Amino acid sequence: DSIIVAVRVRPFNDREKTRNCKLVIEMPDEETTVIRDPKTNDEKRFTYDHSYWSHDGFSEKKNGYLEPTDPHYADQRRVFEDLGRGVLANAWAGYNCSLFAYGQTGSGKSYSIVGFKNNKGIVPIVCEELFKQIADNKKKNMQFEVFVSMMEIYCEKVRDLLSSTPPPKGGLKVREHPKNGFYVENLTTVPVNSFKEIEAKIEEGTKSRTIAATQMNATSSRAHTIVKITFNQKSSKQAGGTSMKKSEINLVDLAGSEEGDRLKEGIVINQSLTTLGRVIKALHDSQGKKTQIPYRDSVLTCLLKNALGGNSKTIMIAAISPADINFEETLSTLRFADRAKSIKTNAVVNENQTERALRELREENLRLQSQIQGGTAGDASNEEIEKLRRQLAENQKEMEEMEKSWQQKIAEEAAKGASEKVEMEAKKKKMCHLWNLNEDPALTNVIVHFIPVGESVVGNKPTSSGNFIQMSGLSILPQHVTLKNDGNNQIHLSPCSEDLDIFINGKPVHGETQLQQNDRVFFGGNHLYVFNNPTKKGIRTDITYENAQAEIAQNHAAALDLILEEELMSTLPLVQRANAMATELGRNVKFEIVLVSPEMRGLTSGLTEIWVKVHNISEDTYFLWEKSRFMNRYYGMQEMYEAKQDGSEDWNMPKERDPFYEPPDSPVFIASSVVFLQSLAYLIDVEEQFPIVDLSGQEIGLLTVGLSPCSTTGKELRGEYVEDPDQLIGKNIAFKVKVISAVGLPRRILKSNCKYRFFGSKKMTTTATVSGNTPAYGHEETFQFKPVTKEVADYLANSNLYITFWGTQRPR
Numbered sequence: 096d097s098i099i100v101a102v103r104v105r106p107f108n109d110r111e112k113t114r115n116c117k118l119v120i121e122m123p124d125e126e127t128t129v130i131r132d133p134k135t136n137d138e139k140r141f142t143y144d145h146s147y148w149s150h151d152g153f154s155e156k157k158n159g160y161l162e163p164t165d166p167h168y169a170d171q172r173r174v175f176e177d178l179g180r181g182v183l184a185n186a187w188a189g190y191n192c193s194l195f196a197y198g199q200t201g202s203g204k205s206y207s208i209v210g211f212k213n214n215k216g217i218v219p220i221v222c223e224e225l226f227k228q229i230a231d232n233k234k235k236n237m238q239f240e241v242f243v244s245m246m247e248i249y250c251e252k253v254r255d256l257l258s259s260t261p262p263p264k265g266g267l268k269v270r271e272h273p274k275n276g277f278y279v280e281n282l283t284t285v286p287v288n289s290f291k292e293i294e295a296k297i298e299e300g301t302k303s304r305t306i307a308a309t310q311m312n313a314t315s316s317r318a319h320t321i322v323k324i325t326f327n328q329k330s331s332k333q334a335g336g337t338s339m340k341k342s343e344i345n346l347v348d349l350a351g352s353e354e355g356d357r358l359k360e361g362i363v364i365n366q367s368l369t370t371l372g373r374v375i376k377a378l379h380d381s382q383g384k385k386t387q388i389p390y391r392d393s394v395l396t397c398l399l400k401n402a403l404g405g406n407s408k409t410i411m412i413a414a415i416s417p418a419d420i421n422f423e424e425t426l427s428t429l430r431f432a433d434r435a436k437s438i439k440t441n442a443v444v445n446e447n448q449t450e451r452a453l454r455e456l457r458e459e460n461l462r463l464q465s466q467i468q469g470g471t472a473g474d475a476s477n478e479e480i481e482k483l484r485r486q487l488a489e490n491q492k493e494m495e496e497m498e499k500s501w502q503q504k505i506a507e508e509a510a511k512g513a514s515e516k517v518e519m520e521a522k523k524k525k526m527c528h529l530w531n532l533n534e535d536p537a538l539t540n541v542i543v544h545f546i547p548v549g550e551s552v553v554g555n556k557p558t559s560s561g562n563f564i565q566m567s568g569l570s571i572l573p574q575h576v577t578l579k580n581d582g583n584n585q586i587h588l589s590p591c592s593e594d595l596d597i598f599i600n601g602k603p604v605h606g607e608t609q610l611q612q613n614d615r616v617f618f619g620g621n622h623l624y625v626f627n628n629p630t631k632k633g634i635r636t637d638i639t640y641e642n643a644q645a646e647i648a649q650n651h652a653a654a655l656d657l658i659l660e661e662e663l664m665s666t667l668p669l670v671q672r673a674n675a676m677a678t679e680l681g682r683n684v685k686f687e688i689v690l691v692s693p694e695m696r697g698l699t700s701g702l703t704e705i706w707v708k709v710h711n712i713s714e715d716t717y718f719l720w721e722k723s724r725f726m727n728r729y730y731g732m733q734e735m736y737e738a739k740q741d742g743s744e745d746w747n748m749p750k751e752r753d754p755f756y757e758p759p760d761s762p763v764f765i766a767s768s769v770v771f772l773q774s775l776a777y778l779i780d781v782e783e784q785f786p787i788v789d790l791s792g793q794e795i796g797l798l799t800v801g802l803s804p805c806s807t808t809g810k811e812l813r814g815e816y817v818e819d820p821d822q823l824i825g826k827n828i829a830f831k832v833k834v835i836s837a838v839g840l841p842r843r844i845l846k847s848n849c850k851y852r853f854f855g856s857k858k859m860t861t862t863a864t865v866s867g868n869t870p871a872y873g874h875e876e877t878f879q880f881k882p883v884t885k886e887v888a889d890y891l892a893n894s895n896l897y898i899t900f901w902g903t904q905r906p907r
């Protein structure tokens with residue numbers, strides 16, 4: 096009784112196609128997946144229960160559904176008929192099931208699980224078929240109960256997506272029922288009678304998820320989302336008194352499966368994924384002395400302990416991208432699904448007599464009551480005598496629900512408000528409104544802010560006054576912007592500060608600006624919206640987060656080709672969130688994207704480097720991070736921001752642990768120098784000054800370097816006259832470079848050295864470190880060449896040495 100692993104390949108999206116990406120994934124049969132290395136053509140061949148090819152051979156119908164043209168395209172209905180049929184059979188049989196999707200952010204976890212628009216995924220049609228199969232097949236005298244729950248797991252904190260109650264500190268409690276396993280205490284479980292009910296419930300759950308993602312940066316790529324459906328079949332008038340069969344389905348959308356500082360990256364964010372990699376590994380290595388599987392090292396592996404080798408039927412969807420750039424991550428995915436493929440689970444039917452279940456629950460209630468008796472009269476650990484009362488209250492609620500009829504349950508739950516959504520969708524046709532625009536496509540156009548017909552103010556102030564639109568969360572000020580609506584005919588947006596970075600259509604805004612139909616407004620952090628006036632023109636709702644960020648990156652690059660644009664599309668939003676998090680967490684640090692062009696490196700064609708300039712205003716220190724280092728320490732920043740939002744006592748943390756601080760004696764790339772080697776091409780011995788430029792491109796100093804030819808012996812060659820540098824070809828000539836001295840270095844620098852790599856040496860030459868701001872490096876190194884090659888001659892005659900400066904600013 097083993098797991099069911101299935102991999103699925105999404106098609107090329109609209110930005111990978113213009114990027115000219117080669118397909119690196121092939122599926123021969125409906126079982127095998129072949130990943131071929133782009134630069135090596137080496138193939139790795141994996142086998143699974145299903146290899147879903149959703150890349151070729153489909154056609155978008157007028158309804159939007161992607162129907163397969165050839166018999167190889169895995170449409171939504173095929174993935175359903177293979178896995179949702181299985182989860183429905185498990186639910187009807189009495190086995191509790193668990194389907195989870197692993198994969199990279201963008202590979203298609205959310206598409207496979209939930210779906211997107213008219214291509215519905217596992218959850219919707221599984222719910223629909225469950226309710227239909229209830230209403231159709233099962234006769235005799237039986238009752239059927241369907242309960243839905245929905246939780247998010249973020250930084251090891253469990254948050255109830257179906258509860259408007261403000262969340263506790265540290266998230267909801269996770270306790271281990273001794274017979275049933277790990278569970279979430281005080282998790283909302285509503286009874287649903289029709290498919291519309293569970294649809295609206297999951298809808299408001301995704302609404303809460305969207306609010307968390309946009310206001311507190313609870314990013315979907317860094318969080319897990321679980322939908323828990325309990326299906327109960329109650330049978331009466333049997334040989335025994337009465338019985339109930341029970342199934343618990345867990346549909347899990349996992350987080351994205353995607354140095355100088357250990358503790359300043361993520362530890363709590365990736366934890367549930369990290370140990371998920373461990374557990375699987377630990378479960379695969381078991382194949383001859385016992386090992387230990389670390390379920391308790393994270394919340395996810397706790398809540399999926401039965402799914403990962405216990406009492407459950409487990410299904411896995413590994414979504415992979417068919418592109419060159421992701422070849423590594425894809426492979427990792429394919430390897431993860433390969434390791435989990437060897438997982439045997441022991442699922443049993445959950446039938447229990449109603450009277451004996453009630454009696455067991457009551458005896459546990461009595462055990463807890465006696466525990467609190469021993470509390471008040473004995474040890475009375477005020478920490479423990481609250482945990483015990485929590486458990487007693489949960490048992491009490493369970494007993495109260497057992498006695499209750501399902502009709503009374505649905506009546507009580509319907510007694511507790513849905514007209515808010517009806518009238519919201521209604522007044523969206525009459526009132527001007529900004530709708531959400533989120534990096535997770537499954538959360539775009541979910542929340543909405545309505546613009547009153549007067550002059551209102553957007554800000555992070557909990558209302559309590561007139562003419563106020565409340566935006567709460569990251570980057571939003573108590574008085575952010577001012578909106579002026581003229582009878583839903585002419586709306587003007589004006590920022591309340593000159594130091595407030597807000598954008599419209601990507602172009603920055605400095606004064607009163609009139610909004611127009613389908614404008615793309617950005618307030619800060621994650622507050623990216625699209626304006627809609629329902630009275631004028633023709634509205635639009637098919638605007639993706641990728642379009643707005645694309646135009647923002649276009650305008651930013653024009654201020655300061657598609658490879659660079661698509662990379663700013665990944666870096667810029669993170670830099671916005673980094674600045675907002677820094678200024679909110681008390682860290683007086685400012686991040687700004689500095690890009691190094693090929694021309695700045697002495698090249699003609701080439702990739703443009705992206706750096707994140709880091710200014711620590713306190714201590715007044717400057718740094719410069721590679722984009723990757725910024726990504727890792729941004730993971731750290733996001734973790735710290737969540738720690739603050741939870742109200743923890745350990746968010747403001749020491750220097751060695753917070754991701755915003757960088758020690759001052761840390762070296763930083765400060766200056767650039769382009770030394771043209773033409774002097775070597777003509778075998779002349781000269782030493783001149785070359786401009787030193789900071790990363791703004793501004794020339795700030797002069798670097799005297801020495802250029803001279805010398806024989807392979809080491810002596811000064813022989814005095815010929817080179818008129819064309821090809822005369823050097825075939826001769827044994829060496830060239831020494833003498834980084835003599837520099838002037839004009841920044842006054843803040845106290846130690847510096849130079850770095851370069853001569854032609855074909857694969858040994859990064861780095862000079863000694865010198866004190867003053869006018870340092871005498873005194874470096875020298877000859878570069879031998881057995882035949883001076885036409886490539887080397889062209890190098891000397893037309894290219895240049897790219898010397899970079901690395902310095903420190905404060906003491907040691």
Ligand SMILES: Nc1ncnc2c1ncn2[C@@H]1O[C@H](COP(=O)(O)OP(=O)(O)O)[C@@H](O)[C@H]1O
Pocket residue numbers: 103104105106108149198199200201202203204205206207211414535536537
């Ligand atoms: N199998 C697929 N078929 C068609 N489109 C897909 C598929 N998988 C993903 N996509 C597209 O890729 C985009 C991002 O996928 P998403 O569901 O966000 O994956 P993840 O949540 O794992 O990042 C979606 O907008 C969707 O339209």
Ligand SMILES: [Mg+2]
Pocket residue numbers: 204205315316348535537
């Ligand atoms: Mg997702």
